[PDB]
């Protein structure tokens, strides 16, 4: 049999009705036939403490995270990563670019009703990943959800109410459920063989702003000034903004004090393509990168020893599968 | 039949290669299927400046009202090009500002240049007169891509696509095909009574995204600003953290309108009942682009603080869903 | 919209265990399986009893005389269950959900059926799901409609076509919207109602029927009309293209124009997922029209064969079963 | 994925013009009014256009009153002007655009160049018409994009001819396909998706023609008996079609089974489908009665295969192998 890992880091699937109780979602699971049929790997939940709303997470939630899948790697054929719903497009992000060289799959769920709850999607949702990591393994950290497996990196919480809460704007998911489990022709990401590398990661202050009509230059003299290390833009359309000469100069000035100013597109599915004024000021493009890739990403580049340059490079590039190269 | 007034604001889809004035309108000459008998009779003004979508501030929507009230009268319906980078914005905003609207007002445009290969505007413009000639609904409404969208439902959602709109949270009023048919969408709350244009003045707001790792200062910072907009987790949540709340706090008391909204494409804001408590109202399922439009609405009011709290929730124009 | 019930009495629903994947093994094994299963007992959930059905039926081996056994059961317990969900298997569930739309007449409680692509007794069977989901909407939605419950979503039975055989969300209503979408919330749409009657529920029979369903495509003969014509046949479905249109050869008009000179129904259909029929728009004239065929509007398939089935079995001379066949009996198609 | 083609040389398009809606007018054809409109409407004859020839087919067909000949005089007329274009773009009746697409995907062998069927639901000029769009993006795509395949163009997708089917009569996105995702999808850009490729031979284009076939086509439906199949064996029939249920499901009653099991005995070619809009056979039964599976074809794509592999001089045995084996890259292996 094959044997998995499933660190148990909280959210809406181990819930009930009044909060995390500890111990809950393990007393369900116990009273539920499915999961010990002879067709089911073997498995072990791990119960973080304290659970979290993935609404409280940190990034150095996510360093947890990576590092307790470091610690069981060598021990286990595939790994489940249970994790509230807000958040969990970040986690699975984040784990992208700090797992380097992955072996095994990693898969991100949950629940958007508690496994307490009636109408519940936690039960489907797990036994769907623990059955998927086993026999249909992808080497990349994916999120399953709803009878979909997504790249981790591409994935936002798209529907806060449906049971189809995620979605994969720029990249088809790369496994369905039906009658039967359907690999789909999704392009491998770029895979490193050899040794899992685990990238620890150190806080790090970003900003994001949003361009709308009658935006001011205040708001990017006001990150300049608390030294925040990158900005990124969520820019209309393919990565156009207002003209306005002050706005300009204000991003100018903060890219002339090594500031990251990354412009992604605030729609939810495209590609950034940006005379040239943004470029002109400094600004880099985020090609179709999800906020919580670019996000996620920033954190990973300013953690490690590299230039203002080297980051800004990198930015662009496709380093775990998040962006379509030209 | 009948007779439709078009605004050409600008936008990509009379651009070249740079907008150039008179190139919509030669082009327009030489296809025969507009001026053809089952069309509308229809005017382009050409509006002086032209302007690229992505450089309209809160005055644009102003004086785009202002061009309708003053044609309102001698067209049987309003068809406004602009570019499709910010054509939510408008449609959200012209929809609060014209009141008792009595006759169609759509607004469109291209993902390609009428001048360049394979451009939608043709088409987009044909289906416009058409819908506003034949099928009038009078509401402010965004045609793209053979549907009709309420326009303070809408987002520019798809950057590359030609089905660049959606309207996540309500269903597309009109579909067209071989025939065109109504949708069975619920009307918006719809006065009636002679046409009012509120005009709006400029007003400071900030739109804050929240994400792991968002600090105080941000709020901290807000606090030259009449409104602050939230985009939340889920339906609504945002990280525990007493600092962030006792700013968001120290943002209400100081009278700054605070709007909770989803960062997700769909859904309903419901929100420990920490953000309440702070003084955040919940936005229920209303887009950026409609919250942001309402806010310049009503700060632009005689209306104090609690009035406009009140309102921020209710449903004025058919840009959110009730309980 | 669909009514919101009250929740304040505990439902009682009757399950009509009728066969299909949902209890299958790799039998008395489904009711066993929901016993097992702590969901199915929480003081939320409605109580429910299962009729076992003897034999268990695969629905590829359904015939109209297993519609009118399922309506006779419904019939036989209307008094003394708040609703009623119809177990079933996948293949047929359309024609079925179809069927007893017309088959009840007067109908004041909701009737909902259900199924699973993967039996319960498998991994990763959705049956789980789909039960407790129609029997939560059955006590708490109670629309007065049959309806097809499938993957989150309340459909109109008479709208149903099952289009998807690999998918969780194997069936569609291809041109009605859902009634009712389950997520965090279970939302009701603005589908606007059926015609309803009034009263205690009335079973109109539904009898076997002898009509043939013919595909249009190139090179099909006037010998295949000329085979039908031969026999007993009632009525002709016909699957057309597009809008409606088929071959505007003499001998292919002339068969038909025979099919309907002697008493035969016939009906044009799409053989499209979606869209409805318009005869005459793509030449001078209304040939199939001229040749006494009757128009099926946007129904389906599914709904065209069993309303025949109803219409035929009923006390209507040929006049008055054409001129019902395009009239909006239970939902099943939009007015012009 | 499909090519990327070179845009240095101009290149010339042949259209064969059948007939469809694209043509007419008020719901007739008239003969030169598509091409006196094409001449009118400036978009056609920009300088980022290839240079294009049209065929006006006589008589101008309604596609509802296509048969299989037509499809022969189509691939006849593909190959007797292949040497001399760089493409083909197929205008024709959305009602049976999906059978032309998959008929000419068996019958040309060797394909070295794009042929695209395409058409409009609206007719061309006439008010909201999808004709001036459906035909400019399939001589752009036919000129830069220029897949070996046949294909069918519609609604800013290009489709594998043999895996599409009229899915929608009323709206402008027609066609679907349902068990393949599109080559192409045109927004801002023209993205071509990673579909992999059919099989493709090589030198000069080989028309296989074909000749009259009488085939059913039987839907499975509930009450049907071993009766209404003897009376498709009553007639003249070499082929049937099964629209079955679901993953390929019918009465397993021994009546049926039996007059399955006695028109495979006389010859006929009894091949099963899903009447479903997408998903794939998968039967004992059927199987031992002697039926063949068409795993995820369409019906479009089998009727044609049939009339293809049937007009070859092949014993049944190897009909029967050759209708479940992938050959033009209408059907999935398992
Ligand atoms: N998750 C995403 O990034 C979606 C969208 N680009 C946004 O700016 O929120
Ligand atoms: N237009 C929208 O508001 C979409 C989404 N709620 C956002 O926050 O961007
Ligand atoms: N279920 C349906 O009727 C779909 C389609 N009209 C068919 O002819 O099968
Ligand atoms: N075109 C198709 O084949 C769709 C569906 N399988 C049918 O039987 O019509
Ligand atoms: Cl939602
Ligand atoms: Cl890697
Ligand atoms: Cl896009
Ligand atoms: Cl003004
Ligand atoms: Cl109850
Ligand atoms: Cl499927
Ligand atoms: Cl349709
Ligand atoms: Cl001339
Ligand atoms: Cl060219
Ligand atoms: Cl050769």
Request: include cysteine.
């Amino acid at each position: 049999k094959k044997s998995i890992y499933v660190a148990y880091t909280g959210g809406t699937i181990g819930m009930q009705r009044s909060i995390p109780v500890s111990g809950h979602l393990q007393r369900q699971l116990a009273l539920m036939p499915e999961f010990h049929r002879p067709e089911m790997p073997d498995f072990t939940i791990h119960e973080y403490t304290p659970l979290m709303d993935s609404s409280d997470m940190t990034p150095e939630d996510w360093q947890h995270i990576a590092e307790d899948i470091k610690a069981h790697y060598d021990d286990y054929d595939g790994f489940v990563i249970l994790h509230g719903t807000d958040t969990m497009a970040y986690t699975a992000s984040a784990l992208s670019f700090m797992l380097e060289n992955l072996g095994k799959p990693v898969i991100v769920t949950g629940s958007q009703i508690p496994l307490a709850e009636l109408r519940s999607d936690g039960q489907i949702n797990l036994l769907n990943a623990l059955y998927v990591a086993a026999n249909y393994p992808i080497n990349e950290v994916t999120l399953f959800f709803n009878n979909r497996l997504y790249r981790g990196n591409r994935t936002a919480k798209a529907h806060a109410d449906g049971f189809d809460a995620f979605a994969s704007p720029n990249l088809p998911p790369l496994l369905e459920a039906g009658i039967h489990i359907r690999r789909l022709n999704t392009p491998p990401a770029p895979h490193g063989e050899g040794e899992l590398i685990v990238h620890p990661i150190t806080p790090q202050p970003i900003g994001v702003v949003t361009i709308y009509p009658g935006i001011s230059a205040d708001v990017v003299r006001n990150f300049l000034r608390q030294p925040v290390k990158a900005l990124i833009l969520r820019s209309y359309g393919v990565g156009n903004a207002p003209q306005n000469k002050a706005f300009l100069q204000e991003l100018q000035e903060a890219s002339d004090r090594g500031i990251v100013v990354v412009n992604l597109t605030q729609c939810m599915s495209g590609k950034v393509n940006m005379g040239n004024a943004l470029a002109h000021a400094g600004v880099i493009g985020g090609a179709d990168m999800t906020v919580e890739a670019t996000l996620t990403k920033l954190h990973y580049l300013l953690s490690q020893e590299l230039d203002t340059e080297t980051i800004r490079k990198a930015m662009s590039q496709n380093l775990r599968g998040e962006l379509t190269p030209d």
